[PDB]
């Protein structure tokens, strides 16, 4: 069609990107991650057991609340690589700026404190394509296509740095936004259909990784960028980082003075300086500051893979093009 579409975005603390869907009728709201990186829809369940902390916290979707609900029960489980949750399927419409699609989706009734009691969003929207879908299910970005209301098949992320009076992001469904992005896309094809991935020819500091080339995951569903334990050992003895439990950190003067890291895609050189990767909470040599930067073991066939987070995103405005299997970048602003 000719409809373009946007969702509002909140930052929470360069960590978390979320917006708001509606489930059901009349519509219970959700906070959502829009991830790239698989293709469930989950909202935590009204029948997830208060034993679960997570869901005494978080929006629960009440399937008795719900005219347009259509029951299907299925159990379904989703291991991400930082934790699982599982529930059972489950159809209603679902809201997502000012779209209205018939979409199956997990109602979630088991959800570990770890991680998501730390946790901004109560669900994800998963933006894959249907080879990595959990149940085979119709992602949602597949039945917003299906409709013919698009002016074409693609999408588009832009995540803001700032997290006051201005807004932590946006989603394009349909097309990109020329307000948050400046030249030219570069567009990079990927590896296969399936999987939002693209080849990596290098990960510079100042090579010394991934020099006989690698896999390179855009993940918008995750905060950091990630690679291999491995290769995230060298690249942090590299840049002289101690390792603690769930991150890496230096000492906070040291972070201005650290080497910008580059990633060769696609032909191109994208860098990123020590600003973009270092949270800058701090001067003090007394004070350890965080690096957005982690380790994450991705079995396959998805993985051994890097992953680039929302530490990537802030810097490149970027195009999923479903239509032609490839990836735009363009410098956010
Ligand atoms: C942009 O903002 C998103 C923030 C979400 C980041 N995050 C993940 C997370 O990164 N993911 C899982 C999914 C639930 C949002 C990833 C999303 N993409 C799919 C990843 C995955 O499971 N993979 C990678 C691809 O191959 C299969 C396994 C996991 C886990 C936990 C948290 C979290 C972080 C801070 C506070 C509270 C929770
Ligand atoms: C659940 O969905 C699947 C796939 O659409 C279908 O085969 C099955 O009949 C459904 N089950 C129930 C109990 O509605």
Redesign the pocket.
């Known amino acids: 069609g000719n409809t373009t579409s946007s969702v509002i975005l909140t930052n929470?603390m360069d960590?978390?990107?979320?917006g708001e869907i509606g489930i059901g009728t009349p519509p219970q709201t959700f906070k959502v991650?829009?991830?790239?990186?698989?293709s469930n829809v989950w909202v935590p369940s009204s029948k997830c057991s208060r034993l679960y902390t997570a869901c005494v916290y978080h929006k629960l979707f009440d399937a008795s609340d719900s005219s347009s609900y259509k029951h299907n029960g299925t159990e379904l489980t989703?291991?991400?690589?930082?934790?699982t949750?599982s529930g059972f399927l489950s159809q209603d419409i679902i809201t997502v700026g000012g779209i209205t699609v018939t979409q199956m989706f997990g109602e979630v009734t088991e959800m570990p404190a770890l991680?998501?009691?730390?946790?901004?969003?109560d669900g994800?929207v998963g933006m894959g394509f249907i080879e990595?879908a959990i149940g085979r299910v119709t992602p949602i970005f597949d039945n917003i296509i299906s409709q013919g209301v698009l002016k074409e098949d693609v999408f588009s992320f832009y995540?803001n740095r700032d997290s006051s009076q201005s807004l932590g992001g946006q989603i394009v469904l349909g097309g990109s936004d020329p307000q948050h992005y400046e030249g030219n896309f570069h567009y990079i094809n990927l590896i296969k259909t399936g999987?939002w991935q693209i080849q990596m020819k290098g990960v510079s500091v100042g090579t010394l990784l991934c020099e006989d080339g690698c896999l390179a995951?855009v993940?918008?569903?995750?905060?950091?960028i990630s690679g291999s334990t491995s290769s995230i050992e060298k690249l942090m003895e590299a840049l002289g980082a101690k390792k603690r439990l769930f991150d890496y950190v230096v000492k906070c003067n040291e972070g201005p003075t650290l080497p910008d890291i580059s990633f060769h895609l696609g032909g191109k050189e994208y860098t990123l300086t020590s600003a973009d990767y270092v949270f800058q909470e701090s001067y003090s040599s007394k004070k350890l500051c965080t690096l957005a930067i982690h380790a994450?073991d991705?079995?396959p066939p998805?993985?051994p893979?890097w992953?680039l987070?929302?530490t990537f995103?802030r810097k490149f405005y970027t195009e999923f093009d479903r239509r032609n299997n490839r990836i735009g970048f363009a410098l956010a602003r």
Do not use: C, H, K, N
């Open positions: 929470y960590t978390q990107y979320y991650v829009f991830d790239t990186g698989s989703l291991r991400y690589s930082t934790g949750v991680p998501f009691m730390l946790a901004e969003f994800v990595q995540y999987v995951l993940d918008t569903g995750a905060s950091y994450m991705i079995p998805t993985g893979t992953a987070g929302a995103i």
